[PDB]
Design a protein around this ligand. Structure first.
Ligand SMILES: C[C@H](CCC(=O)NCCC[N+](C)(C)C[C@H](O)CS(=O)(=O)O)[C@H]1CC[C@H]2[C@@H]3[C@H](O)C[C@@H]4C[C@H](O)CC[C@]4(C)[C@H]3C[C@H](O)[C@]12C
Ligand SMILES: C[C@H](CCC(=O)NCCC[N+](C)(C)C[C@H](O)CS(=O)(=O)O)[C@H]1CC[C@H]2[C@@H]3[C@H](O)C[C@@H]4C[C@H](O)CC[C@]4(C)[C@H]3C[C@H](O)[C@]12C
Ligand SMILES: [Mg+2]
Lengths: 1339, 402, 51, 50, 68
DNA sequence: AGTCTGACGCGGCG
DNA sequence: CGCCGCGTCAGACTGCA
RNA sequence: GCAGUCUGA
């Protein structure tokens, strides 16, 4: 098994054998950023392909050039944690080796005068921590992946939504990765039109005339030529027989014999085969067949030279004779037969007013830059760089692939810019789709939509930065300083470090990380956001992009998505989903060969998946792999239906392939309505980590992956033995076959203790391993927040009964016993950071002091003499944390107060009480104080105190790591000595400093001896300098904001217990708010005196069909019934034979479950450890969509002597009598969401007011005041409550005199308003009078 | 208020572009040509004279310099807001409407009678009211008072600027610049470009983006107009005038509390201490327990044990309104009597949940306190929950067991 | 029942009756022990045939 | 879709029946998220006319 | 329609606060209109008792003591 | 004003 | 073809002049 | 004060 996983073995009820183990969940973020910052010698990816895309840079004249030769990422100045403390970005300096070559003007071929290569620093790029987060300005962010419409060409329609005739207008659109969009669209007149960048449309052939095409060549491209050749007379015309299909002629057709159709008859298909077998070569038709046809060429009279008839002109009898007299025995004509072909180009070649290239170019200039008179050398330079220049247009490699895939070409790679034939083929397929020889693209197809992620977006911003840099360097290179100029002097690193910094810190997709629990972190790192730069907007996205598409199977979770205004725009990548090298989401499938389902998996994209017949994961299989069924249900071409077991081409690789890792942790998901599964998945990400973590009795087995794959846990990098373990440290001694040669062989994991989360919760790593215990590689050594012994544990197992109790569980409420508060099951710790920033003001600087005026020495009790609170001081709402006073002026004491302070004999001091104070209601312990002083500001006494504590801490930690690693090295050196050439006779005597170079047989043993002495010398020498490094990192000043002298940050830990109002929830969307904390003796109790812990309403089950919370409740009862058995055997002190027998029976129960736990392999020590881990209930794994059937739940209940119906009889705690019907009792895994009522409660009598409008402020941060919005004003108008409404308008908010009069009246026992005009109305009058409009009150 | 004396007249963008254009409808001139004359791209003839130079004729500049010799200086054609102001100021209303009233009375195709009665309505509205047409062209610009475009000093050692303060400054520069070019006698092409810039700057101040590309400062995001202050969901009308934030109000999560009577609701002690604070100050000063509102403020923030005995009287018969947004209908605001409870969650009788559409899965409610005797009696007689047991939509009970 | 009480007796008896109904309904729903379990959702034995 | 969910919520919906279920589930949720705007706007228009 | 009949009221404060504010304000400016505060919104804007309900009795005195 | 721009809604209404 | 609208209340976090 | 993001009902 494992060593951490034979501590507590979750009983797995899964029945399918697991073919593909769940991938690394955070490999999206990590793979993409690795591709960004890796050295890519091929130059396709990341920084390298952003550098090679700009460099080499040549001057405007060609006298010189600047060429990239290499790049390198330096070391970060501050580590991930120093960055989070100091509030700075975790970034690395980008050093790029640039070589400036000065070429000769004295040489014709451009010989070089000189080379100067140097390493220029351009920007700092933020490095990604090994958890996929970026530490930007000291806050951890996640750059979520974006799902945008891929570049390429998309043919779409508006399905009869214009011109009110149901006429389908087909439109193609070419979407580059960057550059100008190019749209073609039909009109209800069936004329072809073209937009560029969505502006006003032109006739389409204008673009075809902007290209150097004549009307004759255009009709060559878009048509096929029928030919009339008048040999003697009467319309001798060549015809291929199948042209006439669907055409009805009022003339009959005969040639060289048999007539084949009658006049006025339709030409049938049998007639077509009749024309075929006759091998017909020519047909003579009536002469009026010409009228209505259009000449396919421009014809000129050879006898006179005159223009007879232009091309694209429709022929007539007189025009026909005019052609015939000219000697043109052959005339051509556009084949414009309807309902297979079309005249669309011929007509749009009439409506266009332009007939030559220059006219097309200048008309394009008119539509593009209106109001500007065109110029030929300007119009053609605009047109060339619209679509045909690399610097303004790039159809990216994905664009070219999707392009040639859509136009059905053979080569998937090519030039990144359009060409003549590309636009021609786009128009041709659009015309086809008009005719009916094609079909429109589905815009929501995940073969048409694409994952752009961190390393791609950062490379885009780096490209933008580099192009600003290069447009600066091109003009800077034209100067005369050339021979003395170095490349460092011309590279400005401010555009690059402005672009990347603006993206990483201020973009739409770099979001402040959601750090409630490990599940929040992982699911945030795997969001797929349709929003962002280059994507949709949450208001303009319709109903069709929001819903789930049949290609979302296995690629995107259909049930985990936010419920608000961006439902369906933010998605969550499913469990096994990946991306192509192009960015299209692919998912694995087991290839089915000749009926047997192989274990060879193929990652199919959303377009490859359509061609195959893909079976379900729930399709049964025999021992060797054949489908035991003969008609298996499958998915082909988007639909789903039954097929024979040999038509099947692929198979799903798992049942949880479909859902994301959030919805994968919901046991019995196959029983919940998707509306409630959505809420359960969304609510598992808001559960705060409680004091003492508690595993799920009923889980899905995806807990060990979600916990380990996030970085909350400390997993062992190399197997070994725990050498030392402390609440803040784990020292592992690596095994002998795992340590590299020349190594101490000791891994130190320093655990994170009580740091502030992003959501102000507490993240805290407790050592899981104990002393001397052996650990394997990848074993959890330290549980994080919300992980229990390695598994993710977001909430606690509460004993719920489903029954209505006196209305306290009414309408989604929850009734909690007092023993849930006594045992602190749901008590969570929250850590608040308060900052007191000492400012520089024009009246003088403010000072941090404990000599604040207007406050007695009672409230200054907790401050030390430098003005800052003591660490460990339990402070309450209103306590001064950091005493600060500000120099003030403009008192101008009033006359009565002028008499008052002269009576009692003291005027006010010169300073103002501006000290930091605890907010109202929050009461905690000061657990940390960090003082930052501006470099050049005197450090107060406590700053030096904290600095000496920090310096001795750094010296202690570094001497401790040195004394651990040197101890490991000396142990390894002793091992090398005793391994051969025994010196154990004197090693017990010799001092450790002499072991290093003791003579052994010098073939191999003295080799590692001198190597380990060298390693110890290296350890000492590196400690010797890194100590001074962090010494100067502690002593140095801080790069504070301008204007601040010193910042004191005080951290408060608030142990926040549970109370009525706090939101709790299961995992099946059954949220609720606690109503009452009921006494223990009022809760319903079973025959055994055991009181139920939470009472839930049964009426929340059948309405919202989340039945998964009943089955879980029946399983969590059974899963605890086993625990109460072992708890008995451990208290009776039964033999390990009987314990092993029963635990093996509990592990063997099931209807052909996939796991086999064979305990007879466990030593009696291991069985006793397993029993002590199971005595609180046997954890059960109910994997999603193959979980425990109901019969297994009842069998497990019957094993633990519980009633298989799931319901026991209960007694009222208060009246002592039995409830009339049996009540469902069982153990539900309840969560406590971060919707604490402490954060919600607010009230305000009077406070500060807004500045322009004199209404109150908003939100409990600003001391609020609640918005009496428009609908509430209507609600008062619907009553006759005119006086209530008048006081809500005038004297409560806006009236500035009315509100003070009202306050003095309320105080004086006179409840009477004197309402005037609101200040907003006067503001509105001033704003309307600041237009030219004289609005005025009339008396 | 202040005022900027515009060096040249400047067309008001509201009466120029807010379809139908009052200036266009008044000059019988198409907007697509008045916009050309105003932005200095075409001439228009103020007075025609004995020539083919009819009044409302637009003539481009190249069609103007040839007219410089065709008819000498007998005519006068201008461009910009001076031209349109001369056209407005020159026309006569009482004569023009009288001239149109017969063309309306004589035409039998109503397609033109539509335009004729539109213009007659406009001219009668201009002559009936005291306005004059030439007031649709600003020559003085008012300036909003400075405490309504406040320049807030930031604690960060900086000044956070308004948007109007830009759109005014941007005007006051160009205007000032123009006032130099009228004294330096700069060539008329560059004072044309500066008058065009001043016109577009005043229009950007009054309504940004009416002329397409809107002025944006330092955020790549359009600056806020004067007309953006008063319109939309964020303008004064819907945001500050028709609904406004309100003192004596609070918010909390709701909880069932089924022991309640239909007319009362559980109110936390910690909220009812804050909402009723001036009432408590009054009862403290009345009963001699304090001598000064500052002494009573200290007694309340310390929460001495007599403050709670005061508070139990202050909220004895004093209804509070409870409101859960969205207030879809009248019963969304109901007044209950507060029962002081010790939690932090407002307890809400189970029967009123259907009327509120409230369910206890995390909802919140606002509490408001009626101050005046009339407001307390309105809350008690009109809005109390025992008076609202029937729905106003239909005569069927809304207080229904659920 | 509540509408009949409002039409016959008026507002005050109805406002008392509604509270008495609420109290007694909550009380006897508690006494009921009415609970939902997995065996309450009885699937008809004809289903696997009908399908 | 022509083959129904022949399974109910006491039995398990298998992964395909569940995926099918999600279509109507998200249509309902995205309908609720975007028709409250129409209802509120119609309410506001009715209030301001009356 | 309810929108056109809302914007065609005699009050420009009831129709300028509803929607299309620039239209309503320019047409009420060139017309020289006069809002006499006879509705519910006009009196909510300016801080008065609405003419409905317990303000109705007030709004009648204001009429029977100013029209005389 | 150059963008190594954005567009990439919809439905009435005049 | 341009213009006008597209629910309410609330909490949190950044970055910005 | 604003914009962006997320969340709740
Ligand atoms: C090497 C790799 C497969 C071969 C090709 C195929 C698809 C190409 C990417 C896409 O085009 C999007 C984007 C375009 C930018 O222009 C440059 C960066 C991006 C990420 C490209 C990088 C690289 O060129 C890719 C990955
Ligand atoms: C058990 C283990 C190998 C035997 C010995 C050898 C080196 C010892 C550590 C170092 O001394 C540094 C530090 C000293 C403190 O005093 C106590 C903690 C530390 C971590 C020690 C723990 C323990 O004692 C160690 C790991
Ligand atoms: Mg609710």
């Amino acid at each position: 098994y494992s060593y951490t996983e034979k501590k507590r073995i979750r009983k797995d009820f899964g029945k399918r054998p697991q073919v593909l183990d769940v991938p690394y969940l955070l490999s999206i973020q990590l793979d993409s950023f690795q591709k960004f910052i890796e050295q890519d010698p091929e130059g396709q990816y990341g920084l390298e392909a952003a550098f090679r895309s700009v460099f080499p840079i040549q001057s405007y004249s060609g006298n010189s050039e600047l060429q990239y030769v290499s790049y390198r990422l330096g070391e970060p100045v501050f580590d991930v944690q120093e960055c989070q403390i100091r509030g700075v970005t975790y970034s690395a300096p980008l050093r790029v080796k640039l070589r400036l070559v000065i070429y000769e003007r004295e040489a014709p071929e451009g010989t070089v005068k000189d080379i100067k290569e140097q390493e220029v620093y351009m920007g700092e790029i933020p490095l990604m921590t090994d958890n996929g987060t970026f530490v930007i300005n000291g806050t951890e962010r996640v750059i979520v992946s974006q799902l945008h419409r891929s570049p390429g060409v998309f043919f779409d329609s508006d399905k009869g939504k214009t011109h009110s005739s149901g006429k389908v207008l087909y439109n193609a659109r070419i979407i580059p990765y960057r550059g100008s969009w190019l749209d073609f669209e039909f009109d209800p007149k069936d004329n072809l039109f073209v937009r560029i960048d969505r502006r006003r449309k032109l006739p389409a052939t204008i673009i075809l005339r902007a290209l150097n095409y004549t009307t004759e060549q255009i009709l060559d491209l878009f048509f096929e030529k029928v030919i009339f050749e008048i040999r003697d007379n009467k319309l001798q015309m060549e015809l291929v027989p199948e042209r006439l299909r669907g055409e009805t002629a009022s003339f009959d057709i005969e040639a060289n014999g048999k007539v084949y159709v009658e006049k006025g008859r339709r030409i049938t298909a049998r007639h077509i085969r009749q024309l075929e077998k006759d091998d017909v070569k020519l047909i003579e038709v009536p002469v009026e067949y010409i009228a209505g046809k259009v000449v396919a060429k421009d014809y000129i009279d050879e006898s006179t030279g005159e223009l007879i008839c232009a091309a694209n002109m429709e022929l007539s009898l007189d025009l026909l004779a005019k052609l015939s007299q000219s000697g043109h025995k052959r005339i051509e004509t556009l084949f414009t037969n309807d309902l297979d072909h079309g005249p669309y180009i011929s007509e749009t070649l009439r409506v266009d007013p332009t007939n030559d290239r220059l006219s097309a170019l200048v008309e394009i200039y008119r539509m593009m830059r209106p109001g500007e008179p065109p110029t030929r050398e300007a119009a053609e330079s605009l047109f060339e760089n619209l679509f045909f220049s690399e610097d303004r247009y790039d159809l990216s490699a994905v664009g070219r692939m999707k392009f040639n895939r859509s136009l059905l070409r053979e080569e998937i790679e090519g030039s990144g810019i359009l060409s003549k034939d590309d636009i021609i083929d786009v128009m041709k397929k659009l015309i086809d789709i008009r005719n009916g020889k094609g079909e429109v693209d589905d815009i929501d197809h995940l073969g048409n939509r694409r994952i752009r992620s961190v390393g791609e977006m950062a490379e885009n911003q780096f490209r933008v930065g580099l192009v600003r840099v290069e447009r600066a360097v091109k003009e800077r290179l034209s100067l005369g300083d050339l021979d003395t100029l170095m490349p460092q002097d011309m590279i400005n690193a401010k555009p690059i470090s402005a672009a990347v910094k603006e993206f990483f810190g201020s973009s739409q997709l770099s979001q402040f990380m959601d750090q409630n629990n490990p599940l929040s972190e992982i699911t945030h790192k795997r969001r797929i956001s349709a929003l962002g730069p280059g994507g949709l907007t949450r208001e303009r996205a319709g109903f069709e992009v929001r819903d789930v598409h049949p290609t979302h199977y296995g690629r995107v979770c259909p049930i985990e998505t936010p419920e608000g205004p961006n439902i369906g725009l933010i998605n969550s990548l499913s469990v096994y989903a990946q991306t192509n090298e192009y960015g299209f989401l692919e998912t694995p499938y087991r290839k089915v060969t000749d009926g047997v389902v192989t274990d060879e998996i193929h990652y199919l994209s959303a377009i490859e998946e359509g061609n195959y017949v893909i079976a379900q994961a729930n399709s049964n299989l025999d021992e060797e792999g054949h489908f035991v069924e003969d008609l298996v249900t499958c998915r082909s071409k988007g639909e789903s239906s039954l097929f024979s077991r040999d038509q099947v081409d692929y198979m799903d690789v798992s049942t949880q392939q479909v859902v994301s890792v959030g919805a994968s942790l919901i046991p019995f998901l196959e029983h919940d309505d998707a509306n409630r599964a959505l809420m359960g998945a969304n609510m598992q990400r808001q559960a705060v980590p409680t004091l003492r973590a508690d595993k799920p009795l009923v889980g899905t087995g995806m807990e060990r992956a979600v916990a380990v794959d996030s970085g909350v846990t400390a997993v062992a990098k190399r197997g070994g033995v725990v050498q030392y373990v402390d609440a803040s440290r784990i020292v592992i001694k690596v095994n002998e076959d795992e340590m590299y040669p020349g190594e101490a062989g000791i891994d130190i994991y320093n655990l994170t203790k009580y740091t502030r989360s992003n959501q102000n919760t507490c993240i805290n790593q407790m050592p899981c391993v104990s002393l001397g215990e052996p650990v394997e590689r990848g074993d959890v050594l330290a549980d994080g927040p919300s992980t229990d012994l390695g598994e993710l544990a977001l909430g606690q197992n509460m004993r719920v009964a489903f029954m209505p109790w006196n209305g306290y569980n009414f309408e989604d409420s929850i009734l909690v016993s007092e023993r849930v508060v006594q045992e602190d099951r749901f008590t969570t710790i929250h850590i608040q950071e308060l900052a007191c920033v000492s400012r520089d003001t024009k009246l003088g600087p403010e000072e941090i002091t404990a000599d604040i005026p207007n406050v007695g020495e009672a409230a200054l009790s907790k401050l030390d003499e430098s003005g800052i609170v003591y660490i460990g001081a339990e402070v309450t709402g209103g306590d001064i944390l950091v005493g600060k006073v500000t120099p003030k002026g403009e008192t101008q004491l009033t006359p009565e107060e002028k008499l008052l302070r002269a009576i009692f004999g003291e005027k006010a001091s010169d300073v103002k009480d501006s000290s930091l104070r605890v907010p109202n209601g929050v009461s905690g312990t000061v657990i940390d104080v960090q003082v930052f002083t501006r470099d050049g500001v005197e450090k107060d006494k406590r700053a030096l105190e904290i600095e000496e504590m920090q310096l001795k801490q750094a010296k202690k930690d570094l001497s401790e790591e040195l004394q651990i690693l040197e101890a490991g090295l000396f142990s390894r050196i002793r091992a090398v000595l005793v391994a051969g050439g025994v010196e154990a006779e004197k090693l017990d005597k010799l001092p450790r400093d002499r072991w290093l170079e003791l003579g052994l047989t010098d073939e191999e043993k003295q080799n590692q001896l001198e190597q380990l002495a060298e390693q110890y010398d290296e350890l000492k020498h590196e400690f010797e300098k890194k100590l001074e490094a962090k010494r100067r990192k502690i002593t140095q000043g801080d790069d504070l904001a301008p204007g601040v002298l010193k910042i004191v940050k005080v951290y408060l830990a608030v142990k926040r217990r549970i109370q009525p109002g706090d939101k709790m929830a299961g995992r099946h969307g059954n949220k609720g708010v606690i109503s009452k904390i009921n006494p223990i003796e009022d809760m319903p109790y079973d025959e055994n005196g055991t009181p139920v812990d939470i009472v839930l309403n049964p009426l929340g089950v059948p309405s919202r069909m989340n039945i998964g919370q009943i089955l879980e409740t029946h399983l969590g009862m059974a899963a605890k019934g086993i625990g109460d058995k072992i708890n008995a055997m451990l208290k009776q002190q039964q033999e390990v034979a009987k314990l092993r027998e029963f635990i093996q029976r509990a592990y063997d129960l099931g209807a052909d479950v996939r796991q086999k736990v064979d305990l007879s392999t466990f030593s009696d020590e291991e069985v006793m450890r397993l029993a002590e881990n199971l005595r609180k209930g046997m954890p059960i794994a109910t994997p999603v969509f193959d979980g425990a059937k109901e019969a297994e739940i009842k069998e497990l209940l019957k094993l633990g002597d519980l009633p298989t119906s799931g319901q026991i009889r209960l007694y009222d705690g208060r009246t002592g009598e039995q409830f009339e019907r049996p009540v469902t009792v069982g153990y539900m895994y309840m969560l406590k969401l971060n919707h604490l009522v402490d954060d919600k409660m607010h009230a305000r009598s009077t406070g500060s007011y807004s500045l322009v409008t004199q209404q109150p402020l908003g939100g409990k941060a600003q001391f609020g005041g609640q918005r009496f919005g428009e609908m509430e004003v209507w609600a008062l108008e619907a009553y006759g409550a005119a006086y209530t409404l008048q006081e809500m308008l005038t004297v409560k908010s806006d009236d500035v005199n009315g509100r003070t009069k009202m306050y003095k009246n309320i105080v004086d026992g006179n409840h009477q308003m004197e309402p005037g005009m609101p200040e907003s109305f006067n503001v509105l009058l001033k704003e309307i009078r600041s237009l030219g409009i004289n609005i005025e009150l009339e008396d | 208020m202040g005022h900027i004396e515009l060096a040249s007249p400047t067309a008001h963008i509201w009466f120029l572009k807010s379809l139908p254009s009052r200036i266009g409808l008044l000059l019988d001139m198409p907007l697509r040509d008045i916009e050309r004359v105003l932005y200095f791209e075409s001439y228009v003839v103020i007075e025609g004279g004995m020539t083919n130079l009819e009044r409302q004729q637009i003539l481009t500049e190249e069609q103007y310099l040839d007219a410089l010799e065709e008819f000498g200086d007998e005519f006068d054609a201008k461009m910009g807001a001076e031209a349109i102001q001369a056209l407005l100021k020159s026309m006569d209303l009482e004569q023009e409407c009288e001239q149109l009233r017969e063309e309306l009375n004589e035409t039998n195709s109503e397609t033109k009678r539509k335009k004729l009665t539109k213009r007659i309505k406009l001219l009668e509205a201009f002559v009936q009211s005291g306005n004059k047409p030439e007031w649709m062209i600003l020559t003085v610009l008012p300036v909003l008072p400075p405490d309504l475009r406040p320049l807030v000093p930031l604690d960060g050692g900086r000044f956070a600027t308004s948007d109007l303060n830009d759109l005014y400054r941007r005007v006051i520069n160009r205007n000032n610049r123009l006032k130099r070019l009228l004294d330096l006698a700069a060539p008329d092409i560059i004072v044309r470009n500066e008058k065009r810039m001043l016109q577009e700057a005043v229009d950007a101040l009054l309504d940004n983006g009416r002329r397409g590309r809107a002025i944006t400062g330092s955020n790549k995001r359009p600056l806020k107009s004067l007309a953006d202050m008063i319109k939309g969901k964020q303008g004064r009308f819907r945001q500050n005038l028709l609904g406004k934030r309100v003192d004596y109000s609070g918010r909390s999560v709701i909880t069932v509390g089924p022991y309640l009577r239909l007319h009362q609701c559980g109110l936390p002690k910690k909220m009812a201490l804050e909402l009723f604070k001036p009432f408590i100050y009054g009862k403290l000063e009345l009963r001699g327990l304090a001598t000064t509102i500052k002494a009573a403020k200290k007694m309340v923030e310390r929460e001495e044990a007599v403050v709670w005995d005061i508070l139990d009287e202050v909220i004895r018969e004093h209804p509070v309104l409870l409101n859960r947004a969205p207030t879809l209908h009248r019963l969304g605001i109901q007044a209950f009597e507060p029962v002081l409870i010790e939690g932090k969650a407002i307890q809400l009788h189970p029967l009123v949940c259907a009327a509120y559409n409230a369910d206890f899965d995390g909802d919140q409610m606002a509490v408001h306190v009626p101050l005046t005797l009339e407001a307390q009696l309105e809350a008690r007689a009109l809005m109390m929950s025992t008076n609202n047991i029937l729905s106003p939509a239909n005569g069927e009970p809304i207080i229904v067991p659920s | 029942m509540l509408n009949t009480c409002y039409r016959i007796l008026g507002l005050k008896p109805t406002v008392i009756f509604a509270d008495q109904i609420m109290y007694t309904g909550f009380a006897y729903a508690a006494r009921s022990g009415a609970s939902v379990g997995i065996d309450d959702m009885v699937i008809p034995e004809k289903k696997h045939e009908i399908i | 879709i022509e083959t129904p969910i022949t399974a109910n919520f006491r039995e398990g919906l298998n992964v395909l029946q569940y995926f099918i279920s999600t279509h109507g589930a998200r249509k309902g949720l995205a309908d609720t998220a975007l028709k409250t705007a129409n209802s509120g706007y119609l309410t506001r228009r009715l209030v301001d006319v009356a | 329609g309810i929108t056109k009949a809302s914007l065609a009221t005699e009050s420009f404060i009831s129709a300028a606060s509803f929607q299309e504010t620039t239209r309503v304000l320019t047409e009420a400016a060139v017309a020289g209109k006069r809002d006499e505060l006879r509705g519910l919104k006009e009196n909510v804007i300016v801080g008065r008792l609405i003419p409905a309900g317990t303000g109705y009795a007030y709004h009648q005195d204001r009429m029977r003591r100013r029209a005389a």
